[PDB]
Structure 1
């Protein structure tokens, strides 16, 4: 929260409304965007603010305050411009309300997130040609739970995404400003440069036929690398480890070492290019040959790629086939032949790190399945014929 001034200024500069138009700020509180817009564009507008907490609603006399749950409020009028910084979070009573939300919002998938709902509601309250400018996390660009939100936006209007990054005081959230015009078109991806005067936009690329696919920062080098290799997801089955509880509810699993016992490995045992079979980080041990009973692949030496180490590719070949409590487990597909040592070297390479960092920056904190499935494998490390 607490939208930094330079961010509010940037958003206000992308905003527009016809003289007399209705300007709305959902989850307004004291109305930071209502005020800023008026100061920058003028008084000739109808300013409206919606707040649910009667103790937060602190608006000037020129603004029409409204106490309601934006997500469930049904006004009788559409709006020209919607400005705001929607609440970031899940389920906030809670589960009770959540179900009404789940039935009210069509883009709601998985645990979703409140900001996605605000976006859909906002678009639905917009009149044709209307404009919304929101600051939100960058997770919806790549995450699976936001696939429906992406399709929605793509089909309802033209979308512009301005990458800001980690601009808020709390540093682990990457922000993005979305400028949506309810006048169908495609997607424009912009980057920004932070200077003393604030942000300066820089057009990165445009996708006029965008229909909701993941948004990435592509360059000629990424494109090149991807067309000249095959997707890792065509050569391997990506499997998931058993969660810690499965192990604890499994007999033969001890919480103290002993002879014949092997440590249940975690992401701390995975190093770039090697596995540390020595240090136990889970506090669980079990007879190696018994791991096969939790997941069959535990008995097969295979490739392990990290999902806990952030947005980078850390991989190793588990030659010993130990039980794992996490990470991605890759099993080659039928007929795929590969060179483990060179594949591993390739995945941990600088070029691979540069490639991934270029595309997804810091949108999300960990490498996801969708990012992993598309990693290009040079045909000289593995192939299916």
Structure 2
């Protein structure tokens, strides 16, 4: 619920409004962005803050305060400038997710937002809402998690931004103390088109932006930090996804409902493996991390691919490629499981060595930095491997 002063200062340096313009801080609490903007650019604007919690709303006389759910709020008139730090979190059951609303409210959210996809996130909804509240040519400056650059849940959001105007993304990374989030600033303007990607560096003003790459024809594709070397490697090889079907492991409740699964070791039973069992180039078949055991030979009932040795790639070891050949064909409750496409003939050991290579680790760290704590399917399917006869590049 806080933004560091130098993140505020950076964002205000990116903000613009015509004089007499309408300036809005959604989820405002005491209105730090309104205050910072007014300090920097003076008093000749109309300042509005929207806050859902009356005990949090605390603005000076010069700002209009509104007590409402920003996501359901409909002003009479659109805005010249919208800035701030929206709330984040998945709306769902408290046992698993942090954002708790009545089902009727979540239904209203899904109705209001065309970018709502999968579990989605409050911050996605705040972005779509803000764009919708902009006058043509209006500017939005938000600080949000980096996850929307790459994740499937945000594909509709990226496509929406791409067609609604022009987007600049500035990577900050993990700049909130005591908060484990890699953050970006988004500067969007409701006009023109394209994407500009910027790095940043800490400075006495706060952050200095460094232009990284421009994508004038951006249509909502995943956003990555490309370099000469990442580009060269990709074109030198072919995508891993063109050689393999990529599946995910059966999930924990699938195992818990299977008649042969037990919560205890026993004769003829094998541990159900998790990501903690997967190592670079080998599998630990000994230690049980799942709390579940089953007859090895019945695993194929959950997914057919459990029946034979195959390549397993890690999902939750950060931005890394950690791969092994599961020669025993054990049951897995986690990770990616890669099955060769028709007529593909490879050497498991060669491919494993390549995927685990220092070169491959550097490749993914460059493109995807710390946006998310996973190697995702979208990243995995693009990993460059040797070109194979029958599908070159």
User: What is the TM-score normalised by the length of structure 1?
Assistant: 0.97
SS at match of 2:110: helix
Superposed CA RMSD in Å reads: 1.7
Counterpart-to-counterpart distance in 2, 1:312 and 1:237: 20
Counterpart-to-counterpart distance in 2, 1:256 and 1:185: 58
Matches within 5 A, 1:362-373: 362-373=370-381
Counterpart-to-counterpart distance in 1, 2:115 and 2:388: 42
| Cα drift, residue 384 of structure 1 | 8.7
Structure 2: runs of 5+ lacking an equivalent: 93-100
Contact 1:342 1:381 (C-alpha < 8 Å) held by counterparts: no
Counterpart-to-counterpart distance in 2, 1:295 and 1:113: 30
Number of equivalences: 385
Contact 1:338 1:383 (C-alpha < 8 Å) held by counterparts: no
Q: Relative to 1, partners in 2 of residues 1:332 and 1:382: Cα closer, same or farther, differing over 3 Å?
A: farther
Counterpart-to-counterpart distance in 2, 1:27 and 1:381: 55
Counterpart-to-counterpart distance in 2, 1:338 and 1:22: 61
Q: Which residue of 2 aligns with 1:13?
A: 13
Instruction: After superposition, give the CA deviation of every residue in 1:112-160 in whole Å (9 maximum; x if it has no partner).
Output: 1111111111111111111110000111110101111111111111100
| Cα drift, residue 378 of structure 1 | 2.0
Structure 1: runs of 5+ lacking an equivalent: none
Instruction: After superposition, give the CA deviation of every residue in 1:267-311 in whole Å (9 maximum; x if it has no partner).
Output: 111110001112222222222112122211111100000002111
| Cα drift, residue 44 of structure 1 | 1.1
Contact 2:9 2:205 (C-alpha < 8 Å) held by counterparts: no
Q: Relative to 1, partners in 2 of residues 1:172 and 1:238: Cα closer, same or farther, differing over 3 Å?
A: same
Instruction: After superposition, give the CA deviation of every residue in 1:163-222 in whole Å (9 maximum; x if it has no partner).
Output: 001111234211100000111221000000013441100000000000111000001111
Counterpart-to-counterpart distance in 2, 1:203 and 1:348: 31
Contact 2:149 2:223 (C-alpha < 8 Å) held by counterparts: yes
Contact 2:166 2:194 (C-alpha < 8 Å) held by counterparts: yes
Moved more, 318-327 or 254-263: 254-263
Contact 2:9 2:36 (C-alpha < 8 Å) held by counterparts: yes
Instruction: After superposition, give the CA deviation of every residue in 1:361-385 in whole Å (9 maximum; x if it has no partner).
Output: 0101111110111011123799899
Counterpart-to-counterpart distance in 1, 2:124 and 2:263: 42
SS at match of 1:250: coil
Contact 1:304 1:330 (C-alpha < 8 Å) held by counterparts: yes
Contact 1:157 1:182 (C-alpha < 8 Å) held by counterparts: yes
Counterpart-to-counterpart distance in 2, 1:181 and 1:255: 55
Counterpart-to-counterpart distance in 1, 2:129 and 2:15: 18
Residues 1:207 and 2:215 are matched in the alignment: yes
Counterpart-to-counterpart distance in 2, 1:111 and 1:255: 30
Counterpart-to-counterpart distance in 2, 1:254 and 1:63: 61
Q: Relative to 1, partners in 2 of residues 1:288 and 1:384: Cα closer, same or farther, differing over 3 Å?
A: farther
SS at match of 2:24: strand
SS at match of 2:334: coil
| Cα drift, residue 253 of structure 1 | 2.2
